[PDB]
């Protein structure tokens, strides 16, 4: 079902300059925010503290605060150590969290990327380089794997704290999590590349949660030339998708954009091409190009 | 299993002189450090390194540079010696896989003379035990005196029958300025050796007070009249 | 620089001329994370663009959503201009309500 | 700094137990360790503590650390005359070689001898070889004051240990008038 992600973006320009911004996602809803200039992690939901007590949370925050500055300096040193092997600028990405399951079952992970390539994970008890990782990493890993304190803290964040803290969120956010926002669909078109051909675009916007079916139709028959675009975010935590079909000019009459979604009950959104509403909405859209 | 060693133990420098001190280590240690001990401050890092020729600035790097020719070796350079400067320089090496694995050397003591002319060896005179002590306490104290030396770069030891002894020995932890007034004044130092009156009355037993003095090298030449104040041993022998 | 931004400019709601809407500019697939984004009403900088927090996806590629309140008309033009290192020149993409 | 050692100077009788203190603020606090430094020499490792509440003991030395409290104590049992050298509390901030060391300013220990039979007496050199005085066997309470004169020189109290014997004794010397020296002493003295 759900996946918890703590996301860390660390950027090092030279010896003097660096910053670490973090974001936190349960499923596809952002739960936390940690800007470099803030000393404290900020909730982005009312229910962000999950089920943890004020001091339970503080324990966690204070641990993370220490980690941040500690990690910064540690990287800086790792550079000093890899004297010509690697050099600023350096970009580091962390992805750490949980996969939740039925149970009281749960799987945990901590992945590190370096310059945008996945290189190092944590696994069981130690740090490990992954297949295809640059072989010069072998040393720093050894140097870091000597720190049994860091290892035991990480083991606790991954094995216990994470699956605990997120079960906490799943309750505290249940309402927000399972919410239905109804999609809102509108047709348009542009001229296709090919002469005497048109491209018809069916806009779907404002839906939640993510699964959505969008197809162009001639009656019951699904038009196979339908191309779904990528899921694009709205800022109000809803989604936008568009499906474009390509056809000969004049072939549009009788075509319809069928939408299926969990928010709609059994009632599929069917937009026929030259509909009473298409005609009118398109009129509200005219522009000078 | 082995040792970390700083050369030299003692060092004579003049105002504005360029000064170097080596440090060698056979622990296979990748990290090597140069600290400075200031009275009532504790160690402050000057320069470290992760191997040759990595040199990284510590909190006290201003006024110094360092260089790591090889794993085994780490040199620090004092760019301009301060006027009245007195400092101890300590060297430490460390494993990269054991934060703890840090081993220190025996330290380097720097004295900045002002000028060179002022440098003198000690004069060693061994004194015999007062006979009143023998009847009274049945024990015999010898007293040694190295006198008129500068700077306090000295190592006194007692030798009986050609072997060095430590039991029944005492040496002043503090040298005594002969002229407490004029900075750089020469120093005076006292040391004692107490043995059995029975051991001393025998004149087969051979007593000697050796003083190792650390002065000028053959490397810096010297253009004054009398004896060159080199690194030397001057002792006073008695039976 | 490692990667070139993919830029997509779209609106929150269906556009009705002279009725207030929200314009999204979603920048993706770029690397390094340092980037400069602005939104333009007729070549001019839109005073109060609001940014989402920077983030990345499973394939380690950064993304970020810029958005603003706007009111679409017949003749007003709206664009999203990005400055990134993997581009010698800034790349401006224009809103086109029809595609 | 971020490591405070107390007190600045300790004085204890030989054979007594002496307690040395160290408080810190360094973070994180991966480990604390103790160092002995003899006069004019290196730092010798005494004991290394790691755990949240740890106890370690090497030889005579025994040390405890409370992390919560950010505090450490070093105990020396049955202190000897050797124990004279200064003592250094050092906190390390990483469990990796990336991490470094934060140094305390140190504590001087001063071990005073237990003179079991004090026989205060001043003798005369003599003065060999061919070029022509000691004040000895006094007790702990007696402290020799150096002269207000430039002509005469008077060294501070020194303790020697004749090891085969079970014997220790304080020592001092003056030179430039033997019967009169270093006044500012017990009258029980011999001449
Ligand atoms: C140039 C090329 C570069 C190469 C590129 C690759 C990069 C290398 C990989 C990067 C990893 C670097 C790690 C560096 C760490 C360090 O720099 C930083 C260094 O300081 C450490 O502090 C640790 C915590 O205080 C200490 O542990 C403590 O040691 C104690 C002993 O003194 C003691 O340990 C004792 O007891 C233990 C267990 O019993 C053991 O027995 C042990 O042997 C004992 O000694 C404690 O139990 C430990 O907790 C450790 O001594 C110290 O050294 N480490 C720590 O801070 C330890 C924690 C590390 C955290 C890592 C988490 C990763 C990402 C999180 C990002 C998330 C963003 C913010 C989060 C928002 C809030 C989210 C809310 C939900 C929270 C829960 C989510 C769970 C998922 C994370
Ligand atoms: C956290 O869980 C991990 C694995 O889920 C445990 O780590 C080890 O797993 C490895 C496989 O990589 C085995 O070789 C080891 O036997 C496991 N370690 C130990 C000490 O048995 C780890 O034990 C868990 N950590 C904690 C603190 O519970
Ligand atoms: C380091 O890099 C940043 C570029 O992001 C720059 O603004 C800063 O001035 C640089 N400083 C130095 C000392 O190179
Ligand atoms: C990020 O935060 C740290 C501590 O607040 C600071 O030292 C550093 O300069 C910051 N980096 C920036 C603003 O780029």
Rounded to whole angstroms, how far apart are CA atoms D189 and D191? 7
Which of these, B109, B113, B196, B112, lies nearest to B153 by C-alpha position?
B109
Rounded to the nearest angstrom, the distance between the alpha carbon of B109 and the centre of ligand 3 is: 41
Residue A47's SS3 state is helix
Instruction: Specify whether the CB–CB gap between D107 and D90 falls below 8 A.
Output: no
Exposure string (b/e) for D35-51, b if CB count within 10 Å is 16 or more?
bbbeeebbbeebbbbbe
Residue A231's SS3 state is coil
Rounded to whole angstroms, how far apart are CA atoms B159 and B143? 13
Q: Which residue in chain A is spatially nearest to C74 when comparing CA positions?
A: A287
CATH number, domain containing residue C49: 2.60.40.10
Report, at the CATH architecture level, how domain B1-114 is classified.
Sandwich (2.60)
Chain B CB contacts of A143 under 8 Å are 96-97
Rounded to the nearest angstrom, the distance between the alpha carbon of B184 and the centre of ligand 3 is: 49
Mutate-to-test residue for ligand 2 from A121, A124, A126, highest number of ligand atoms within 8 A of CB: A124
As assigned by CATH, the class of the B115-239 domain is mainly beta
Distance from CA of C13 to the nearest CA of A (A): 7
Nearest to D30 among A77, A143, A149 (CB): A149
Rounded to whole angstroms, how far apart are CA atoms B201 and B58? 59
D134-136 and D167-175 beta bridge pairing: antiparallel
Say which residue the tokens 């007696």 belong to.
Answer: D142
Residue A118's SS3 state is strand
Ligand nearest to the CA of A65: 1
Rounded to whole angstroms, how far apart are CA atoms D136 and D144? 11
What are the residues whose beta carbons fall under 8 Å from the beta carbon of B123, sequence distance 6 or more? Answer: B146, B147, B148, B149, B234
Q: Which residues of A are part of a known binding site for a D-galactosylceramide?
A: 74, 147-150
Residue A15's SS3 state is coil
Atom number in ligand 3 closest to CA C34:
5
Resolution of the experimental model, in Å, one decimal: 3.1
Q: Is B99 on the interface with A (CB under 8 A)?
A: yes
Domain segments of chain A as ranges: 1-178, 179-275
Say which residue the tokens 């319809």 belong to.
Answer: A256
Name the experiment that determined this structure.
X-ray
**CATH topology for A179-275?**
Immunoglobulin-like (2.60.40)
Rounded to whole angstroms, how far apart are CA atoms D84 and D36? 9
Chain B CB contacts of A142 under 8 Å are 96-97
The residue contributing the CA closest to ligand 2 atom 9 is A124
Cβ-based contacts under 8 A for chains A and D: 29
What are the residues whose beta carbons fall under 8 Å from the beta carbon of D153, sequence distance 6 or more? Answer: B176, B178, B188, D147, D174, D175, D176
Ligand nearest to the CA of A34: 1
CA-based end-to-end distance of chain C: 30
Chain B CB contacts of D31 under 8 Å are 99-100
Rounded to whole angstroms, how far apart are CA atoms B12 and D186? 44
Residue B69's SS3 state is strand
Long-range contact pairs involving A116-122 (C-beta distance under 8 Å, separation at least 24): A116/A91, A116/C2, A116/C3, A116/C31, A116/C60, A116/C61, A117/C60, A118/C60, A122/A154, A122/A158
**Degrees to nearest 5, angle at CA B204 with B203 and B206:** 85
Which of these, B208, B205, B202, B197, lies nearest to B132 by C-alpha position?
B197
Chain A CB contacts of C17 under 8 Å are 284-287
Tell me B134's DSSP state: H
β-strand partners of B196: B139
Sheet order of strands, A42-43 included = A42-43, A29-34, A18-26, A3-12, A90-101, A105-114, A117-123, A126-129
On the CB side of A28, CA atoms within 13 Å amount to: 18
CA distances from B137 to A187, B194, B232, C70, D117 (A): 119, 11, 37, 108, 11
Joined together, the tokens standing for residue D86 give 């200064």
Rounded to whole angstroms, how far apart are CA atoms D22 and D107? 10
Number of domains in chain C: 1
Rounded to whole angstroms, how far apart are CA atoms B10 and B20? 12
DSSP characters over C10-71: EESS---TTS-EEEEEEEEEEBSS--EEEEEETTEEPTT-EEPPPEE-TTS-EEEEEEEEE-
Q: Helices A54-81 and A138-145: crossing angle, nearest 10°?
A: 140
**Ligand 2 in reach of A155 Cβ (< 6 A):** yes
Ligand nearest to the CA of A148: 1
D101-103 and B169-171 beta bridge pairing: unpaired
On the CB side of B236, CA atoms within 13 Å amount to: 20
Residue of B45, B66, B97 for testing the chain A interface, max A β-carbons within 10 Å: B97
Distance from CA of B237 to the nearest CA of D (A): 8
Tell me B150's DSSP state: B
Domain segments of chain B as ranges: 1-114, 115-239
Tell me B51's DSSP state: S
Q: Is B62 on the interface with A (CB under 8 A)?
A: no
Atom number in ligand 4 closest to CA A20:
1
Joined together, the tokens standing for residue A147 give 């720190």
Rounded to whole angstroms, how far apart are CA atoms B49 and B52? 8
Ligand nearest to the CA of A14: 3
Q: Is D68 on the interface with A (CB under 8 A)?
A: no
Rounded to whole angstroms, how far apart are CA atoms B143 and A72? 61
What are the residues whose beta carbons fall under 8 Å from the beta carbon of A267, sequence distance 6 or more? Answer: none
> Do C and B touch (≥3 CB pairs < 8 Å)?
no
Q: Is D27 on the interface with A (CB under 8 A)?
A: yes
Peptide bond before residue A85 is cis, with ω within 30 degrees of 0: no
CA D11 to chain centre: 7
The 3-state secondary structure of chain D, one letter per residue: CCEEEECCEEEEECCCCEEEEEEECCCCCCEEEEEEECCCCCCEEEEEECCCEEEEEECCEEEEEECCCCEEEEEECCCCCHHHCEEEEEEECCCCCCCCEEECCCEEEEEECCCCCCCCEECCCCCCCCCCCEEECCCCCCCCCCCCCCCCEECCCEEEEECCCCEEEEEEEEECCCCCCCCCCCCCCEC
Tell me B129's DSSP state: P
Q: Which residue in chain A is spatially nearest to D28 when comparing CA positions?
A: A66
Q: Which residues of A are part of a known binding site?
A: 74, 147-150
Query: C24 vs A232: CB contact, 8 Å cut-off?
Result: yes
Nearest to C22 among A35, A235, A244 (CB): A235
Distance from CA of D91 to the nearest CA of B (A): 11
Nearest to A143 among D27, D28, D96 (CB): D96
Rounded to the nearest angstrom, the distance between the alpha carbon of A90 and the centre of ligand 3 is: 13
Residue A64's SS3 state is helix
DSSP H or E segment with residue B135: helix B131-137
For chain A, the residue count is 289
Rounded to whole angstroms, how far apart are CA atoms A26 and B20? 59
Chain A residues with CB within 8 Å of chain B CB: 80-81, 83, 142-143, 146-147
**Degrees to nearest 5, angle at CA A149 with A146 and A152:** 105
DSSP H or E segment with residue A107: strand A105-114
Joined together, the tokens standing for residue B173 give 């932890």
Query: B98 vs A146: CB contact, 8 Å cut-off?
Result: yes
> Which ranges of chain A does DSSP label H, i.e. alpha helix?
54-81, 138-145, 148-156, 162-172, 174-177, 276-283
Domains present along chain D, CATH in parentheses: 1-113 (2.60.40.10), 114-191 (2.60.40.10)
What is chain C's Cα-based Rg? 14
What is chain A's Cα-based Rg? 25
Which of these, B182, B28, B159, lies nearest to B113 by C-alpha position?
B182
Rounded to whole angstroms, how far apart are CA atoms D49 and D61? 13
Nearest to A146 among B50, B56, B97 (CB): B97
**Ligand 2 in reach of A148 Cβ (< 6 A):** no
Rounded to whole angstroms, how far apart are CA atoms D46 and D89? 10
What range does the domain containing C17 cover? Answer: 1-99
Chain A residues with CB within 8 Å of chain D CB: 66, 70, 73-74, 77-78, 143-144, 146-150
Report, at the CATH architecture level, how domain A1-178 is classified.
2-Layer Sandwich (3.30)
Query: A74 vs D96: CB contact, 8 Å cut-off?
Result: yes
Query: A147 vs D96: CB contact, 8 Å cut-off?
Result: yes
């Amino acid at each position: 079902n759900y996946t918890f992600r703590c996301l860390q973006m660390s950027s090092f320009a030279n010896r003097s300059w660096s910053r670490t911004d973090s974001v936190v996602w349960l499923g596809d809803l952002q739960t936390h925010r940690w800007s470099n200039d803030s000393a404290t992690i900020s909730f982005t939901k009312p229910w962000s503290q999950g089920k943890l007590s004020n001091q339970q949370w503080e324990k966690l925050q204070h641990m993370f605060q220490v980690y941040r500055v500690s990690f910064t300096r540690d990287i800086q040193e790792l550079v000093k150590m890899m004297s010509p092997k690697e050099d600023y600028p350096i970009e580091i990405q962390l992805s750490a969290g949980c996969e939740m399951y039925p149970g009281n079952a749960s799987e945990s992970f901590l992945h590190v990327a370096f310059q945008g390539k996945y290189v190092v994970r944590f696994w069981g008890t130690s740090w490990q380089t992954v297949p295809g990782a640059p072989s010069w990493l072998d040393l720093p890993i050894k140097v870091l794997n000597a720190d049994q304190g860091t290892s035991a803290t990480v083991q606790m964040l991954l094995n216990d704290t994470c699956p605990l803290f997120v079960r906490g969120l799943l309750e505290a956010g249940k309402s927000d999590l399972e919410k239905q926002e109804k999609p809102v669909a509108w047709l348009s078109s542009v001229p296709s590349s090919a002469h005497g051909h048109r491209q018809l675009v069916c806009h779907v916007s404002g839906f939640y949660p993510k699964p959505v079916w969008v197809m162009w139709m001639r009656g019951d028959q699904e038009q196979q030339g339908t191309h779904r675009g990528d899921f694009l975010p709205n800022a109000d935590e809803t989604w936008y998708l568009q499906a474009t079909l390509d056809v000969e000019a004049g072939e549009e009459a009788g075509l319809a954009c069928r939408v299926k979604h969990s928010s709609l009950g059994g009632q599929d959104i069917i937009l026929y091409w030259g509909s009473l509403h298409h005609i009118l909405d398109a009129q509200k859209m005219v522009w000078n190009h | 299993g082995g040792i970390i060693t700083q050369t030299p133990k003692f060092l004579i420098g003049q105002e504005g002189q360029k000064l170097t001190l080596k440090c060698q280590q056979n622990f296979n240690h990748d990290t090597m450090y140069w600290y400075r001990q200031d009275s009532g401050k504790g160690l402050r890092l000057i320069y470290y390194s992760y191997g040759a020729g990595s040199t990284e600035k510590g909190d006290l790097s201003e006024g110094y540079d360092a260089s790591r020719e090889k794993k085994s070796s780490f040199s620090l350079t004092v760019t301009s010696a301060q006027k009245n400067e007195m400092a101890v320089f300590l060297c430490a090496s460390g494993s990269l896989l054991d934060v703890r694995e840090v081993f220190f050397g025996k330290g380097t003591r720097l004295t900045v003379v002002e000028d060179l002319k002022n440098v003198f060896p000690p004069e060693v005179a061994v004194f015999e035990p007062s006979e009143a002590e023998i009847s009274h306490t049945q024990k015999a104290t010898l007293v040694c005196l190295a006198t008129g030396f500068y700077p306090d770069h000295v190592e006194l030891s007692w030798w009986v029958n050609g072997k060095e002894v430590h039991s029944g020995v005492c040496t002043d932890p503090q040298p005594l300025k002969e002229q407490p007034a004029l900075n750089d004044s020469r120093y005076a130092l006292s040391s004692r050796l107490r043995v059995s009156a029975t051991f001393w009355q025998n004149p087969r037993n051979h007593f000697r007070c050796q003083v190792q003095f650390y002065g000028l090298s053959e490397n810096d030449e010297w253009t004054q009249d009398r004896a060159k104040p080199v690194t030397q041993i001057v002792s006073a022998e008695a039976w | 620089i490692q990667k070139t931004p993919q830029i997509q400019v779209y609106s929150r709601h269906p556009p009705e001329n002279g009725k207030p809407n929200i314009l999204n500019c979603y920048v993706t697939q770029f690397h390094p994370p340092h980037i400069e984004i602005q939104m333009l009403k007729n070549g001019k900088k839109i005073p109060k663009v609001e940014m989402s927090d920077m983030s990345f996806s499973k394939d380690w590629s950064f993304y970020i959503l810029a958005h603003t309140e706007f009111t679409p008309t017949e003749t007003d033009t709206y664009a999203c201009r990005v400055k990134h290192a993997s581009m010698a020149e800034p790349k401006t993409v224009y809103w086109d309500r029809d595609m | 700094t971020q490591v405070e050692q107390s007190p600045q100077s300790l004085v204890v009788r030989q054979g007594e137990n002496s307690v040395l203190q160290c408080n810190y603020s360094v973070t994180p606090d991966n480990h604390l360790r103790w160092f002995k430094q003899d006069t004019g020499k290196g730092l010798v490792s005494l004991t290394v503590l790691v755990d949240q509440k740890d106890k370690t003991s090497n030889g005579r030395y025994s040390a405890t650390l409370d992390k919560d409290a950010k505090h450490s104590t070093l105990h020396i049992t049955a202190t000897l005359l050797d124990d004279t050298a200064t003592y250094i509390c050092v906190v390390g901030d990483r469990g990796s070689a990336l991490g470094r060391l934060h140094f305390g300013a140190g504590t001087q220990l001063i071990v005073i001898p237990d003179i079991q039979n004090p026989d205060p007496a001043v003798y005369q050199l003599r003065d060999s070889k061919s070029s022509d005085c000691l004040f000895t066997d006094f007790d702990s309470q007696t402290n020799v004051s150096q002269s207000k004169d430039s002509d005469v020189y008077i060294t501070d109290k020194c303790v020697l240990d004749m090891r085969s014997m079970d014997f220790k004794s304080n020592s001092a010397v003056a030179w430039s008038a033997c019967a009169n020296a270093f006044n500012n002493i017990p009258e029980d003295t011999f001449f």
